[PDB]
Amino acid sequence: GMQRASRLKRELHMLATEPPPGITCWQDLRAQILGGANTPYEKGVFKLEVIIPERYPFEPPQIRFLTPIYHPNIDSAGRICLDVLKLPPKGAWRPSLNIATVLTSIQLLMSEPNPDDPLMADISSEFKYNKPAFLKNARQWTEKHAR
Amino acid sequence: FTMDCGICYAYQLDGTIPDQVCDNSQCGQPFHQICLYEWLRGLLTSRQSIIFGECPYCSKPITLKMS
Ligand SMILES: [Cl-]
Ligand code: NA
Ligand SMILES: [Zn+2]
Ligand SMILES: [Zn+2]
């Protein structure tokens, strides 16, 4: 488990010195993603849980939303449907990725939901066939739980 | 100046250095023997005679000789 420590040693330092815009992550780990501009999550602060498995970085981090969010690919429990969060061949995780990139991926997922990989079938359908209704609901959900 | 392992982000690991370099000239990421082996062994696309798998960065073929 020497590799887990060396990874965390450098990643935490870099996450503290030059983190992705709108994203912070500090020692289990806590992460925060600020709601993006021109998204229904704007002006929302989303806390996340980041658990680093014993076999990191050979296994992907385990990340869930602590802050409730209204999203097609994120369930009520904060579970995230994202390929880089799962091992191959089904998933897309590899040691070339890290905490910063995975979080950026989650941030990108928030901006651009994937209707083809739904965890919330109801929210997913709304996103496809009634975008404004989805946006309206996501806004209210953000105002109610994310600020 | 000398470069960290592309997998564990460290320079020294168990007294070894990242001397396992990607063949691909468009990549060339250095790895520890230990780290690259630990990653490749679990991959279905890997083969062993010396071990063959994919670079965790460029996905191109990579050869790892253990010692
Ligand atoms: Cl880093
Ligand atoms: Na995961
Ligand atoms: Zn290494
Ligand atoms: Zn490579």
Numbering used by the authors:
A (entry chain B): 0 to 26, 33 to 152
B (entry chain Y): 303 to 351, 354 to 371
The publication says:
This monoubiquitination event is key in signaling the recruitment of downstream DNA repair factors. The FA pathway is required for DNA interstrand crosslink repair.
In order to obtain high-resolution data to observe the interface, we fused human Ube2T to the C terminus of the human FANCL RING domain with a linker between the proteins. Subsequently, we determined the structure for the E3-E2 pair, the FANCL RING domain (residues 299–373), and Ube2T (residues 1–153) to 2.4 Å resolution. In complex with FANCL, Ube2T adopts a typical UBC-fold comprising a four-stranded beta meander, flanked by an N-terminal helix and two C-terminal helices. The interface between the RING domain and Ube2T buries a total surface area of ∼700 Å2. In common with other E3-E2 structures, the interface consists of a conserved hydrophobic interface between Pro62, Phe63, and Pro100 of Ube2T and Ile309, Trp341, and Pro360 of FANCL, as observed in other RING-E2 structures (Bentley et al., 2011; Dou et al., 2012; Plechanovová et al., 2012; Pruneda et al., 2012; Yin et al., 2009; Zheng et al., 2000). However, the hydrophobic surface of FANCL is extended by Tyr311, which is involved in pi stacking between Arg6 and Arg9. Further analysis of the interface reveals an extensive electrostatic and hydrogen bonding network between residues Ser5, Arg6, Arg9, Arg60, Arg99, Ser101, and Asn103 of Ube2T and Asp306, Tyr311, Glu340, and Ser363 of FANCL, with additional main-chain interactions with Ile309, Cys310, and Tyr361 of FANCL. Additionally the nonconserved Asn103 of Ube2T further anchors Tyr311 of FANCL into position.
